[PDB]
Design a protein around this ligand. Structure first.
Ligand SMILES: [Ca+2]
Length: 124
């Protein structure tokens, strides 16, 4: 629907589904095992992963798609910070998936911004 403040929830649910099914998401699907990799929290302040993102959205615990976007971007910035070189195949995966996410999220954010101005201002 045009001017739908709820539309982002379905749009982001679909986008996450397409990310989970993409081979490039494999390293990012689940929280890093902090017991297997006990230096991970030495480097990364705030772990994030696509399963946490998907559960947060399904729970209704994101206020806006900007919040979900900030979490997804944290996945990719965490991977950049943790991986040791741009030669890492894991970093390479994070670049391909990042570029895919950013291509699709822009219209979700734009559509949400317009919907919210309508929600706040309309005299229907
Ligand atoms: Ca790095």
């Amino acid at each position: 629907m045009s001017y739908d403040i709820q539309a982002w929830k379905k749009q982001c649910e679909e986008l996450l589904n397409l990310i989970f099914q993409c081979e490039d998401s494999e390293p990012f699907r689940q929280p890093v095992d902090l017991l297997e990799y006990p230096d991970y929290r030495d480097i990364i302040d705030t772990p994030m992963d696509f399963a946490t993102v998907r559960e947060t959205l399904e729970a209704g615990n994101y206020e806006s798609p900007m919040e979900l976007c900030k979490d997804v971007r944290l996945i990719f910035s965490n991977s950049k910070a943790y991986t040791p070189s741009k030669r890492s195949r894991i970093y390479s995966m994070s670049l391909r998936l990042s570029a895919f996410f950013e291509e699709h999220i822009s219209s979700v954010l734009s559509d949400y911004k317009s919907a919210l101005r309508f929600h706040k201002r309309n005299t229907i």
